[PDB]
């Protein structure tokens, strides 16, 4: 599992559950093609998005549907969604954890790259 | 100014200077049209991107070119850029301050919305 | 003003108003002595805490009373308060801006230091 | 394990390893008494600080020695240390994860409270 996502709720101090996540890879038209997707689990995590063999070097976009999450809670949010765009390269470490901490008018995102 | 951007560097404890910023607006055809662009000043601020008359209801994307910023400092960062996507002015005109706090593997973004 | 504090509310997308702030300085005896205190304005800012003459080299503690702020809004937050502890002016006088971004279960603090 | 700590490095995009952590409980003199301590593991975590039986309701302080961590990396940091102060109460959930994301001039902290 080379790519994991974790999403936390800073209003309730809990994992962000059932949040939809879409992952795209940059195509050589400079166009985003769907790559993987899923919903966060009860621990706010999503793994199993891809495998080592298919996760090749390239530019990836992780899109988190934060607006639906806040509306589900009856909170009016600012952002349409949160996005994380990055390059994956085989030289450096090989396991990627993308974390996102959500508030109605702010978000923070962090990447942990190990091995 | 109805739209302002402020960018800070959490490694040096300073404003992030000469960071390129591009703003887009979602068009009729669901395409991102270029709306305004600029570079942050010595105070890490960008104003004067638009006027209240031109800044109509719509969905906007503020893209902050963080990778060029870190690479010019000698650091290879995780993200390609930081993006903020939001609906603006749908309940009447407002003023928006978009702030971003940057680190090589993390960033935080906050919006302040005033009437 | 050599020491300023700015506090923002990430749930409402606004400055955090009337937040109490207390500043302490570590004394000879390794005790925290009260140094200055105040409340943030309608812009979420506090200035006028000290002068360059009084703001000598030392270790300072800025304590932001976040719990009272959230409780007055109807929310029971995680933290008792946010604290920032730092050495100031040890290489000559500087100006410090301490910013805090607040959510009920999370906060971020940033310092901007200028010569 | 009712209390876990996790510390991440936003400059290197990795766990913060070998960081010292001290935990204090508020005594009825309004004095902080040592409660537990340890160093973060290679995954940036510290568990086993206390047990369900000893972790009773009270006010706790988690102190992370961030200044030594940055100096070990040859980076000049702003803060003397990072502190998290909170009340534990038996009504609500019972498992506490305190996370801290570290930059030289900024830190963010989040609490996840489950069950």
UniProtKB/Swiss-Prot annotation, chains A, B, C, D:
- Impact of changing residue 41 to I on the protein? In AMYLD1; amyloid cardiomyopathy
- Which consequence is recorded for altering residue 50 to K? In AMYLD1; amyloid cardiomyopathy
- State what changing residue 88 to G does: In AMYLD1; amyloid polyneuropathy
Q: What is the effect of changing residue 78 to M?
A: Loss of tetramerization
Where is the protein found, in the record's own terms? Secreted; Cytoplasm
Effect ascribed to mutating residue 107 to S: In AMYLD1; amyloid polyneuropathy
Outcome of substituting residue 100 to T: In DTTRH; increased affinity for thyroxine
Q: What is the effect of changing residue 75 to N?
A: In AMYLD1; vitrous amyloid
The record's Gene Ontology biological-process terms are: negative regulation of glomerular filtration; phototransduction, visible light; purine nucleobase metabolic process; retinoid metabolic process
Q: Which residues carry this modification: Phosphoserine?
A: 43
The listed outcome for residue 62 to A is:
In AMYLD1; amyloid polyneuropathy
User: Effect of altering residue 24 to I?
Assistant: In AMYLD1; Jewish 'SKO' amyloid polyneuropathy
Phenotype when changing residue 9 to G: In AMYLD1; leptomeningeal amyloidosis; leads to unfolding and exposure of N-89 to glycosylation by STT3B and subsequent degradation by the ERAD pathway
Indicate the impact reported for residue 75 to S.
Answer: In AMYLD1; amyloid polyneuropathy; almost no RBP binding
**What residues bear 4-carboxyglutamate in this entry?**
33
Q: Which parts of the sequence bind L-thyroxine?
A: 6, 45, 108
How this chain assembles, per its entry, is:
Homotetramer. Dimer of dimers. In the homotetramer, subunits assemble around a central channel that can accommodate two ligand molecules. Interacts with RBP4.
Q: Which family does it belong to?
A: Belongs to the transthyretin family.
Question: What does this gene product do?
Answer: Thyroid hormone-binding protein. Probably transports thyroxine from the bloodstream to the brain.
Q: Which disease is it linked to?
A: Amyloidosis, hereditary systemic 1: A form of hereditary systemic amyloidosis, a disorder characterized by amyloid deposition in multiple tissues resulting in a wide clinical spectrum. AMYLD1 is an autosomal dominant form due to transthyretin amyloid deposition. Protein fibrils can form in different tissues leading to amyloid polyneuropathies, amyloidotic cardiomyopathy, carpal tunnel syndrome, systemic senile amyloidosis. The disease includes leptomeningeal amyloidosis that is characterized by primary involvement of the central nervous system. Hyperthyroxinemia, dystransthyretinemic: A condition characterized by elevation of total and free thyroxine in healthy, euthyroid persons without detectable binding protein abnormalities.
- Name used for this protein in its record: Transthyretin
UniProt organism field: Homo sapiens (Human)
